[PDB]
Design a binder for this molecule. Structure first.
Ligand code: CLA
Ligand code: CLA
Ligand code: CLA
Ligand code: CLA
Ligand code: CLA
Ligand SMILES: CC(=O)O[C@H]1CC(C)(C)C(=C=C/C(C)=C/C=C/C(C)=C/C=C/C=C(C)/C=C/C=C(\C)C(=O)C[C@@]23O[C@]2(C)C[C@@H](O)CC3(C)C)[C@](C)(O)C1
Ligand SMILES: CC(=O)O[C@H]1CC(C)(C)C(=C=C/C(C)=C/C=C/C(C)=C/C=C/C=C(C)/C=C/C=C(\C)C(=O)C[C@@]23O[C@]2(C)C[C@@H](O)CC3(C)C)[C@](C)(O)C1
Ligand SMILES: CC(=O)O[C@H]1CC(C)(C)C(=C=C/C(C)=C/C=C/C(C)=C/C=C/C=C(C)/C=C/C=C(\C)C(=O)C[C@@]23O[C@]2(C)C[C@@H](O)CC3(C)C)[C@](C)(O)C1
Ligand code: KC2
Ligand code: KC2
Ligand SMILES: CC1=C(/C=C/C(C)=C/C=C/C(C)=C/C=C/C=C(C)/C=C/C=C(C)/C=C/C2=C(C)CCCC2(C)C)C(C)(C)CCC1
Ligand SMILES: CC1=C(/C=C/C(C)=C\C=C\C(C)=C\C=C\C=C(C)\C=C\C=C(C)\C=C\C2=C(C)CCCC2(C)C)C(C)(C)CCC1
Lengths: 176, 154, 143, 166, 70, 167
C-alpha cells in the first residue's frame, strides 16, 4: 500500500531509492514513461519554476536592471519583447538545452550507464548532493511549481500587487 | 424445422396453425409469407422513392401512391401484370418440383449451407415482416390524408 | 457456407455450379424454353422460336429505319424484317447442310431431318410473327 | 462491519464505538434513521425545485401549493392544522409502523438488524453478499444525503434558496 | 472551458465513452471489473477513453451550439 | 399450462376466463409470451392512468421543454393530455421512445419474454408462495382495471360524454 494513498498499491518502479519518493503515483505513469526521464522533466520544471517565482517576485517588488522597462511582471514579457532584448535570454537557453539536455536525454533513453535525470554534476561550490539536499531540492521545486501556477493565474485574474488577492493581506489574514 | 423464429417473440404461434397442418400446408404458409414480405418490401421502396423522385412519365404522375397507379397508362399495367404472372408461373413450376424449398428459387439445398445462411434467411424474413406492416400503413395513410409517405412526414 | 461447388461433383470439368448456372430459377427457365422443352417436336421448337423472333424483329426497322418519317414506315419495316428472316433461314439451312452431313435418325435437332424441320418451323413462325406485329402496329390505337 | 468500507475504513476519529462497543447498534440505528430522513428531505428539495402540486392547500386559507417556496418559508406558509396533521402522521409512522427501538432508548432489536423496521411485506435480498452491498450503499447514501441536507438547510436559511450562488 | 452546460456535457460524454468502450473485448459495460481493466490496460484505458470522449464531446457541443439548444 | 398461470379472477369466473378459446391451441413458450405482453400492457396502463390524473389535474414541471423552439410544460398541461402531448417536439418524443427502446432491448436480451413471462430482475417483496401468488393476482387485476380505465379516459375526452364520471 502506498504511503500517500492508503487505498492503493504503490507501483514497483517507485521503490524508495529516489529522492522525494512518497508513493504518490495513482495513475501509474512510471510504467509507460521511464522514471529517469520523468525525474529529469520534474527537476527541469521545478528549477524553472523556482527561478520564475523568485524573478516574478523581485520584478514585482521593483528590482529592475537599468535600461529595462519599469513594468510589473505581468506586462514584463510584452515590454521586453517590444523593447528587443529578450532573444538574448533565449540564446543561452538555446545552447544549454541543445548541448546538455538533448545528449543527456538520449543518454537516459538509450545508455544504461548514464547519470540520473536532472544530474548535471553541477557542484561548483561543492555544497553536496546528499539525500537531504536532494529531498529539499525536490520539495522546494514542487512547492515552486504550485506557487508559480497560483501566482500567474491569480495575477492575470486580479491585476493587483504582490499578494495577488483581491483584498490583499486581508484574504490571507481574514482577522484584518 | 424452419427459420422464422427470432429473439423478440420466439416461436410466435398463439393460434396453432403449425401443428395439425400438413407439411404441404406449412410449405404453402412459408411461401406465402416470403412472397408477402418481398412484395411488401418492393412496395415500401417504391413508395419511398416515388414520393420525391419520379422522373418517369415526364414527372407528371402524382406522388400519391393510390392515384399514381390510376394515372399510369393501361399498357404499363398490362405489362407489369404479365411480368408478375411470368414470375408466378415460375413459382408454380418450382412448387411442382420434387425438391421444393418454400421460397427458394436459388436452390440452396444443393450447397453446403451453414448457420450463417439461416441467419441471413431470418434477416430477409424479419425485414419482410416489417415491410408487410409498413406498406399497409403507407397505403392507409395515402387513403386517409391523400399524401404519400415522405410528403406526410414533411 | 460454400455457394460455388464443382459442376456435377466434377472438380476437373471447366465449369462451376454457381447460383447463376445451376439455381432452380435458371434450370426452370432454360428447361422450359422451347429449345430445351420436353416433348416438343423440332417443328414446334422452330415455330415458337420463329414467332418470338419475328414479332420483335420488325420494331427496329420500323422506328429507326431510313423511312421512319414516311407514310410507308411500317411497310418498309416489315419488308426489312422479311429480308432479315430470309437471310436467317438461309443461314439455318446452310448450317444444317454443313453440320448434319450424314444422318438417318430424325426427330432430333442434331440430325438432318430434325434440323430441316426446325428451320421450316422457324421460317413460318418468323413470317407469321412479323405479319402479326405489322397488324398490331397498324391497329395500335386499340391499346 | 457495515458502514466500514471505502476511502476510509473504520472511521471513528473520537473513538465512540471503540470506547463503548455495546452502543454500536444504537449508533447504527440513529445513523440509519438520520440517513433515511435525509434522503427523503433531499429528494423533497430536488423535486420541489421543479414540480409543484396543483390544487388548494386549504380551502379555508388562501394558500395554494404553488405559492409556497421550497424551504423554511415554504414550510412556514402552511396552516397550523396541516402542520399538526404532518406531525401526527410522522408520529404514527414512527411509533407504530417503523419503531426503531422495540422498547426504550438503547434497546434496538437483538434478533433483527438495527434499522430493520419494515414488516413482512418488504423487498428482501436472499443472498448475503448482495444484502451486504445493498445495506452498505444504503448507509453510505444516508451519510451523503444528510451532509447534503445540512448544506441545503444552511443555504436556504442564509439566502433563501437551497442552491447557492454560482 | 467556459459554460457549466459545456462542462456537464463534456463530463457526461467522457464518462459514457469510458463506460461503454471496449478494448480487446474487455469493458465496463461488458461486465469487466474496474480493477481488472486498470491492471490489464493501465492509464491507456483513461487516455484513449478521454480522447474519444473529447472528440464526441466536441461533436455534440458544436452540434448543440449550431442548433441553439445550448 | 393455462391453468398453472396466476390470473384467474374470481369476480368473472373461478377458473381461467377464455370465452373465444384462444389458449386452447398454444405453446408453453407462446403462453409465456402472451402473459409477458399482458403484464407489459398492465404496467403501461397503470403508469398512463397516473400520468393522465397528474397532467389533467394541473400537475406539471416548472420549465421550458425546448430552448430553441419556445416550448414549456405549462402550455402542454393547459392544452390537456391528448393535446398537450401533441404539443411536444417530435425530437423529444423520439428521444423518449429511444430511451424506452434501449431499456426494452436490454431487458429482453437479459430476460427473454418467452423464457420469463414478464418476470424481470426487480427484487421481490415477499417469498411466501401464497403471498407471491396473491400479489401476482392483485397485479393482474389492478392492471386489467387500469387498461379499462385508460381506454375509458381516452374515449371520454376524445368523444365528450362517453363515460359516466371521468374524475
Ligand atoms: C400474412 C402473412 C404471414 C404468413 C403467411 C405467415 C406465416 C408464418 N409465420 Mg408469421 N408473421 C407475419 C406474417 C405472416 N406470417 C408478420 C407480419 C409477422 C410480424 C409480427 C410475423 C411474425 C412471425 C414470427 C415471429 C414467426 C412467424 C412464424 C410463422 C409461421 C407459423 C405461423 C402460421 O402458421 O401463421 C399462419 C398465418 C396466417 C394463416 C396468416 C393469416 C392470419 C390471420 C387469420 C389474419 C391476419 C392477422 C391479423 C388480423 C393481422 C392484420 C390486422 C392489421 C395488422 C392490419 C408461418 C410460416 C413462425 C415461424 O416461422 O416459426 C418457424 C415464427 O416464429 N411469423
Ligand atoms: C453500332 C453502332 C450503330 C448504331 C447504334 C446504328 C444505328 C442505326 N443505323 Mg447504322 N451504321 C453503323 C453503326 C451503327 N448504326 C455503321 C458502322 C454504319 C456504316 C456501314 C452504319 C450505316 C448505316 C446506314 C447506311 C443506315 C444506318 C441506319 C441506322 C438506323 C437503323 C438501322 C437498322 O435498321 O438496324 C436494325 C437493327 C436490328 C434489326 C437489331 C439491333 C439489335 C437489337 C436491338 C439488340 C437487342 C439486344 C438484347 C437487349 C439482348 C438481350 C435480350 C434478352 C434479355 C431477352 C439506326 C439509327 C439507317 C437509318 O435510317 O439511320 C437513321 C441507315 O440508313 N446505319
Ligand atoms: C446528439 C448530438 C449531435 C447533434 C445535435 C449534432 C448535429 C449536427 N452534426 Mg453532428 N456529431 C455528433 C453529435 C451531434 N451532431 C457526434 C457525437 C459526432 C462525432 C464527433 C458528430 C460529428 C459531426 C460531424 C463530423 C459533422 C456533424 C455535423 C452536424 C450537423 C449536420 C448533420 C447532418 O444532417 O449532416 C448532413 C447529412 C448528411 C447525410 C451528409 C452526408 C455526407 C456524406 C459525406 C455523403 C448538425 C448541426 C456536420 C456539420 O456540418 O456540422 C455543422 C458535420 O460535418 N456532426
Ligand atoms: C423503439 C422502442 C421500442 C422497442 C424496441 C420495443 C420493443 C418491444 N415492445 Mg414496445 N413499446 C414502446 C417502444 C418500443 N417497444 C413504447 C414507447 C411503448 C409504450 C409504453 C411500448 C409498449 C409496449 C407494450 C405494451 C408491449 C410492447 C411489446 C414489445 C415487444 C414486442 C414488439 C412487437 O411485437 O410489436 C408489435 C406491434 C404491433 C403489432 C402494433 C401495436 C399497435 C397497437 C394495436 C395500437 C418488444 C420487446 C410487447 C411485449 O413485450 O410482448 C411480449 C408488449 O406487450 N411494447
Ligand atoms: C400496484 C400494482 C402492482 C403490483 C401489485 C405489482 C406486483 C408485482 N410487480 Mg410490479 N409493476 C407495477 C405495478 C404493480 N406491480 C407498475 C405500475 C410497474 C411499472 C413501473 C411495474 C413493473 C414491474 C416489473 C418490471 C416487474 C414487476 C414485478 C412485480 C412483482 C414484484 C414484487 C413486488 O414488489 O410486488 C409488490 C408490489 C406492491 C405491494 C405495490 C406497491 C405500490 C405502491 C404504490 C408503493 C409483483 C408481481 C416483477 C415480476 O416478476 O413480475 C412478474 C417484475 O419483473 N413489476
Ligand atoms: C417499499 C417496497 O416495497 O419496495 C421498495 C424497497 C426499497 C429497498 C426501499 C427500494 C428502494 C429504494 C429507494 C426508495 C431509494 C431512495 C433513495 C434516495 C431518496 C436517495 C437520496 C439520496 C440523496 C443524496 C445522496 C443527496 C446528496 C446531496 C448533495 C451531495 C448536496 O450537498 C446537494 C448539492 O450539492 C448539490 C447536488 C448541488 C450544489 O449546488 C450544492 C447542494 C448542497 C445544493 C425499492 C427496491 O426500490 C422498492
Ligand atoms: C453515552 C454517553 O455518555 O454519551 C453519548 C450519548 C449522547 C450524550 C446522547 C450523545 C449525544 C447527542 C449529541 C451530543 C448531539 C449533538 C448534536 C448536534 C451538535 C447537532 C447540531 C445541529 C446543527 C444544525 C442542524 C445546524 C443548522 C444550521 C442552520 C440551518 C443555519 O444556517 C444557522 C445559521 O447560523 C448560520 C450558519 C448562518 C446565519 O447566517 C443564519 C443562521 C443563524 C440560521 C452522544 C454523542 O451519542 C454521546
Ligand atoms: C366504479 C368505478 O370505478 O367506476 C368508474 C370510475 C372511473 C374513474 C370513471 C373509471 C376509471 C378508471 C380506473 C378504474 C382506473 C384505475 C386505475 C388503477 C387501478 C391504477 C393503478 C395504479 C398503480 C400504480 C401507478 C402503481 C405503481 C407501483 C410502483 C411503481 C411500485 O412502487 C412497485 C414496485 O416498486 C415496488 C414497491 C417494489 C420494487 O420491486 C419495484 C416495483 C416496480 C415492483 C371507470 C373505468 O369508468 C370506472
Ligand atoms: C400527513 C398526511 C395527511 C393525511 C394522512 C391526511 C388525512 C386526512 C383525512 C383522512 C384520514 C381526512 C378526512 C383529511 C381531511 C382534511 N385534511 Mg388532511 N391529511 C394529511 C395532511 C394534511 C395537510 C398538510 C393539510 C390537511 C388538510 C385537511 C383538511 C382541510 C382543508 C381545508 O383547509 O379546506 C381536511 C378537511 C389541510 C388543513 O388542515 O387545512 C386547514 C392541510 O393543510 N391534511 N385529511
Ligand atoms: C426519456 C427521457 C430523456 C432522457 C433520458 C434524456 C437524456 C438526455 C441526455 C443524456 C444525459 C442528453 C445529453 C439530452 C440532451 C437533450 N435533450 Mg433529452 N432526454 C430525455 C427526454 C427529453 C425530452 C422530452 C426532450 C429532450 C430534449 C433534449 C435536448 C434539446 C433541447 C432543445 O430543443 O432545446 C437536448 C440537447 C428536448 C428536445 O429535444 O426538444 C426539441 C425535449 O423536448 N430530452 N437528453
Ligand atoms: C424473361 C425476362 C425478360 C425478357 C423478356 C422477353 C425476351 C420477352 C419477349 C417477348 C416477345 C418477343 C414476344 C413475342 C410474341 C409473339 C407473338 C404473340 C407471335 C404471334 C404469331 C402468330 C399468331 C403467327 C401466326 C401465323 C403463323 C404461325 C404462320 C402463318 C401466318 C400466321 C400469321 C397465321 C426481361 C428482360 C423482361 C426481364 C425479366 C425476365
Ligand atoms: C439473346 C441471346 C443471345 C444474345 C444476347 C445479347 C446480349 C446480344 C445479341 C445481339 C445481337 C445478336 C444483335 C444483332 C444485331 C443485328 C443487326 C444490327 C442487324 C442489322 C441488319 C440490317 C440493317 C440488314 C439490312 C438488310 C436486309 C434486311 C436485307 C437486304 C440487305 C440489307 C443490308 C438492306 C445469346 C447469343 C448470348 C444466346 C441466345 C439468346
Amino acid at each position: 500500500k502506498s504511503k500517500s494513498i492508503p487505498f492503493l498499491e504503490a507501483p514497483p518502479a517507485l521503490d524508495g531509492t529516489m529522492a522525494g519518493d512518497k508513493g504518490f503515483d495513482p495513475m501509474r505513469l512510471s510504467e509507460v514513461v521511464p522514471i529517469q526521464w520523468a525525474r529529469e522533466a520534474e527537476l527541469k520544471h521545478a528549477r524553472i519554476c523556482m527561478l520564475a517565482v523568485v524573478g516574478w517576485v523581485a520584478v514585482d517588488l521593483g528590482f529592475t536592471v537599468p535600461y529595462a522597462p519599469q513594468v510589473s511582471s505581468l506586462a514584463a514579457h510584452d515590454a521586453a519583447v517590444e523593447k528587443g532584448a529578450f532573444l538574448f535570454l533565449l540564446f543561452p537557453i538555446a545552447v544549454v538545452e541543445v548541448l546538455a539536455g538533448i545528449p543527456k536525454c538520449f543518454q537516459i533513453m538509450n545508455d544504461p550507464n548514464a547519470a540520473p535525470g536532472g544530474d548535471y554534476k553541477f557542484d561548483p561550490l561543492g555544497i553536496g548532493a546528499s539525500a537531504d539536499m536532494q529531498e529539499k531540492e525536490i520539495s522546494n521545486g514542487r512547492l515552486a511549481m504550485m506557487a508559480f501556477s497560483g501566482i500567474v493565474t491569480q495575477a492575470a485574474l486580479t491585476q493587483a500587487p504582490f499578494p495577488y488577492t483581491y483584498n490583499g493581506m486581508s484574504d490571507l489574514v481574514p482577522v484584518l | 424445422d424452419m427459420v422464422g423464429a427470432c429473439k423478440p417473440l420466439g416461436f410466435f404461434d398463439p393460434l396453432g396453425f403449425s401443428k395439425d397442418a400438413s407439411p404441404a400446408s406449412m410449405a404453402k404458409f412459408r411461401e406465402a409469407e416470403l412472397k408477402h414480405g418481398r412484395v411488401a418490401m418492393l412496395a415500401c421502396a417504391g413508395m419511398i422513392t416515388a414520393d420525391k423522385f419520379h422522373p418517369l412519365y415526364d414527372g407528371k404522375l402524382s406522388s400519391n401512391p393510390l392515384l399514381a397507379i390510376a394515372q399510369v397508362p393501361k399498357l404499363g399495367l398490362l405489362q407489369i401484370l404479365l411480368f408478375i404472372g411470368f414470375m408466378e408461373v415460375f413459382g408454380i413450376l418450382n412448387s411442382r418440383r420434387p425438391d421444393y424449398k418454400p421460397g427458394d428459387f436459388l436452390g440452396s439445398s444443393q450447397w453446403d449451407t451453414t448457420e450463417v445462411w439461416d441467419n441471413y434467411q431470418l434477416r430477409e424474413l424479419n425485414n419482410g415482416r416489417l415491410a408487410m406492416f409498413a406498406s399497409i400503413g403507407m397505403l392507409t395513410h395515402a387513403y386517409i390524408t391523400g399524401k404519400g409517405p415522405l410528403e406526410l412526414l414533411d | 457456407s460454400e455457394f460455388v461447388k464443382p459442376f456435377n461433383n466434377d472438380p476437373f470439368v471447366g465449369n462451376l455450379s454457381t447460383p447463376v448456372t445451376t439455381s432452380t430459377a435458371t434450370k426452370l427457365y432454360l428447361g422450359n424454353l422451347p429449345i430445351y422443352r420436353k416433348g416438343l417436336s423440332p417443328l414446334m421448337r422452330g415455330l415458337e422460336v420463329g414467332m418470338a423472333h419475328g414479332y420483335f424483329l420488325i420494331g427496329p426497322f420500323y422506328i429507326l429505319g431510313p423511312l421512319r418519317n414516311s407514310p410507308n414506315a411500317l411497310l418498309v419495316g416489315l419488308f426489312s424484317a422479311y429480308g432479315l428472316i430470309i437471310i436467317l433461314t438461309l443461314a439455318l439451312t446452310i448450317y444444317g447442310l454443313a453440320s448434319f452431313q450424314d444422318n438417318s435418325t430424325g426427330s432430333n435437332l442434331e440430325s438432318s431431318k430434325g434440323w430441316r424441320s426446325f428451320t421450316s418451323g422457324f421460317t413460318v413462325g418468323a413470317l407469321g410473327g412479323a405479319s402479326v406485329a405489322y397488324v398490331l402496329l397498324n391497329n395500335v390505337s386499340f391499346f | 462491519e457495515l458502514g466500514a468500507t471505502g476511502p476510509l475504513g473504520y472511521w471513528d476519529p473520537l473513538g465512540f464505538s471503540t470506547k463503548q462497543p455495546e452502543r454500536f447498534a444504537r449508533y447504527r440505528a440513529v445513523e440509519l434513521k438520520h440517513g433515511r430522513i435525509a434522503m427523503a428531505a433531499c429528494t423533497g428539495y430536488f423535486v420541489q425545485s421543479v414540480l409543484r402540486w396543483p390544487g388548494y392547500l386549504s380551502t379555508s386559507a388562501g394558500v395554494k401549493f404553488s405559492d409556497l417556496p421550497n424551504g423554511i418559508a415554504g414550510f412556514a406558509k402552511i396552516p397550523p392544522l396541516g402542520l399538526a396533521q404532518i406531525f401526527l402522521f410522522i408520529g404514527l409512522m414512527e411509533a407504530f409502523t417503523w419503531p426503531f427501538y422495540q422498547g426504550g432508548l438503547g434497546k434496538v432489536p437483538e434478533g433483527k438488524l438495527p434499522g430493520d423496521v419494515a414488516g413482512d411485506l418488504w423487498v428482501r435480498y436472499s443472498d448475503p453478499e448482495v444484502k451486504k452491498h445493498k445495506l452498505n450503499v444504503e448507509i453510505n447514501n444516508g451519510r451523503a444525503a444528510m451532509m447534503g441536507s445540512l448544506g441545503m438547510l444552511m443555504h436556504d436559511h442564509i439566502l433563501g434558496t437551497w442552491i447557492p450562488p454560482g | 472551458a467556459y459554460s457549466i452546460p459545456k462542462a456537464f456535457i463534456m463530463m457526461f460524454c467522457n464518462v459514457l465513452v469510458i463506460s461503454t468502450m471496449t478494448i480487446q473485448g474487455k469493458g465496463l459495460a461488458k461486465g469487466t471489473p474496474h480493477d481488472e481493466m486498470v491492471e490489464s490496460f493501465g492509464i491507456t484505458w483513461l487516455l484513449a477513453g478521454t480522447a474519444l470522449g473529447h472528440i464526441v464531446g466536441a461533436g455534440t457541443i458544436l452540434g448543440c451550439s449550431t442548433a441553439g439548444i445550448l | 399450462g393455462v391453468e398453472d398461470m396466476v390470473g384467474a379472477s374470481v369476480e368473472v369466473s373461478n377458473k381461467v376466463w377464455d370465452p373465444l378459446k384462444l389458449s386452447a391451441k398454444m405453446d408453453e413458450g407462446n403462453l409465456n409470451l402472451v402473459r409477458a405482453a399482458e403484464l407489459k400492457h398492465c404496467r403501461v396502463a397503470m403508469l398512463a392512468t397516473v400520468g393522465w390524473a397528474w397532467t389533467a389535474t394541473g400537475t406539471h414541471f416548472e420549465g421550458m421543454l425546448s430552448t430553441s423552439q419556445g416550448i414549456s410544460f405549462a402550455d402542454a398541461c393547459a392544452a390537456g393530455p391528448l393535446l398537450g402531448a401533441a404539443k411536444v417536439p417530435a425530437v423529444g418524443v423520439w428521444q423518449i421512445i429511444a430511451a424506452i427502446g434501449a431499456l426494452e432491448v436490454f431487458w429482453e436480451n437479459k430476460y427473454p419474454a418467452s423464457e420469463c413471462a414478464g418476470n424481470f430482475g426487480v427484487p421481490w417483496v415477499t417469498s411466501d408462495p401464497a403471498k407471491m401468488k396473491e400479489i401476482q393476482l392483485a397485479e393482474l387485476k389492478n392492471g386489467r382495471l387500469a387498461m379499462i380505465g385508460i381506454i375509458s379516459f381516452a374515449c371520454a375526452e376524445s368523444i365528450p360524454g362517453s363515460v359516466p364520471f371521468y374524475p
